A paper describes a structure:
KAI2 receptors, classified as plant α/β hydrolase enzymes, are capable of perceiving smoke-derived butenolide signals and endogenous yet unidentified KAI2-ligands (KLs). The KAI2-mediated signaling pathway shows homology to another phytohormone signaling pathway, strigolactone (SL), where key proteins involved in KAR signaling (KAI2, D3/MAX2, and SMAX1/2) share sequence and structural similarities with proteins in the SL signaling pathway. The SL signaling pathway comprises a homologous receptor to KAI2, D14 (DWARF14), the D3/MAX2 E3 ligase, and a homologous substrate SMAX1-LIKE 6, 7, and 8 (SMXL) in Arabidopsis or D53 (DWARF53) in rice. When focusing on the binding pocket, several residues including the Ser-His-Asp catalytic triad are conserved in all proteins, highlighting its importance in the catalytic mode of action performed by α/β hydrolases.
Rice, a significant crop and representative of grasses, relies on KAI2-mediated Arbuscular mycorrhiza (AM) symbioses to flourish in traditionally arid and nutrient-poor environments. This study presents the first crystal structure of an active rice (Oryza sativa, Os) KAI2 hydrolase receptor. As observed in previously determined KAI2 crystal structures, OsKAI2 comprises of a canonical α/β-hydrolase fold with the binding pocket situated within the central core domain, beneath the helical lid domain (residues Tyr125-Ser197). Upon a closer inspection of the binding pocket, the conserved Ser-His-Asp catalytic triad is positioned at the base of the active site. The pocket comprises a hydrophobic cleft made up of phenylalanine, isoleucine, and valine residues, making it well-suited to bind the aromatic rings of KAR or KL-type ligands. The OsKAI2 pocket was compared against that of AtKAI2 (48) which shows similar pocket residues, with the exceptions of C162 and A191 in OsKAI2, which represent smaller side-chain groups in the positions of A161 and G191 in AtKAI2. The OsKAI2 pocket analyses revealed a pocket measured to have a volume of 108 Å. This is an intermediate pocket size when compared to others in the family, such as AtKAI2 with an approximate volume of 63 Å, OsD14 at 149 Å, and ShHTL7 (51) at 215 Å. Strikingly, due to its distinct proximity to the ligand binding pocket, residue C162 was selected for further inspection. Interestingly, grass KAI2s contain a cysteine at this site, resulting in a receptor that is sensitive to both (−)-GR24 and dYLG ligands. Therefore, the C162 found in grasses may be important for selectively sensing grass-related KLs or grass-related KL AM signals in the soil.
Author numbering: 0 to 270
Write the structure that this text describes.
Amino acid sequence: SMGIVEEAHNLRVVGEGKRGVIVLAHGFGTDQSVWKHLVPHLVADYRVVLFDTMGAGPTNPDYFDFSRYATLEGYALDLLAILQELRVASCIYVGHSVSAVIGAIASISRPDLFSKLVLLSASPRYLNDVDYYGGFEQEDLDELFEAMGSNYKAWCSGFAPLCVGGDMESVAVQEFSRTLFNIRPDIALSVAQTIFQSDVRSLLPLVTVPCHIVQSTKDLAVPVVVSEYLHKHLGGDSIVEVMPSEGHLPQLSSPDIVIPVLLRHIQHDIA
């Protein structure tokens, strides 16, 4: 229907609402299905754009250009190309995990395209640094990459429960383990490296669009102080809400708690 963007990113547009356009962008290891519980709440007031990030399970690996995605800039360029194709004057953008940062980077280039950013499970840097707590030391990354490269399937089964949190036998843990294992293992290792070694802290002052910073109180990959870091270093107005949820994909695993929070941040503007 919409062409290369639709074929390459499985782009879907639903809803017939007139308050505006909402773009939903998923994190590493999942796909647009991560939004399944949010979309029904948005279609009455909004037009909702869903897409899969290049290299996600449902995408064709033949379109994955390793040089393009060597930095997160390539993902931000993909997002700008989607927004331009869509002929959006502006949108509410909800970015999960790495897509939070991808949106923020895109918004530096084209602040006109974004009325606000909702940053769910966001971090500007996973590695600790001097006076900065991201939750990870380089040794932890080396152990992670070693598992990923030794037996990716076993890694997926062992990682899913830690990342999703809550009960191990839950539908959500099984679902994420499956979407993780849909990533071709060479793409998975490459992208994980790119993400886990990225550091966009010095870019945050350039972000001028209002940002709503939403995360789980207990999230393996995002210590709560990271929300505070974002709040103190973004270049525009921001607000933080730490949810009484566990896990890095809480819109999938605890929607009864999380969907109301996301809807409030979508609907209510900060001064």
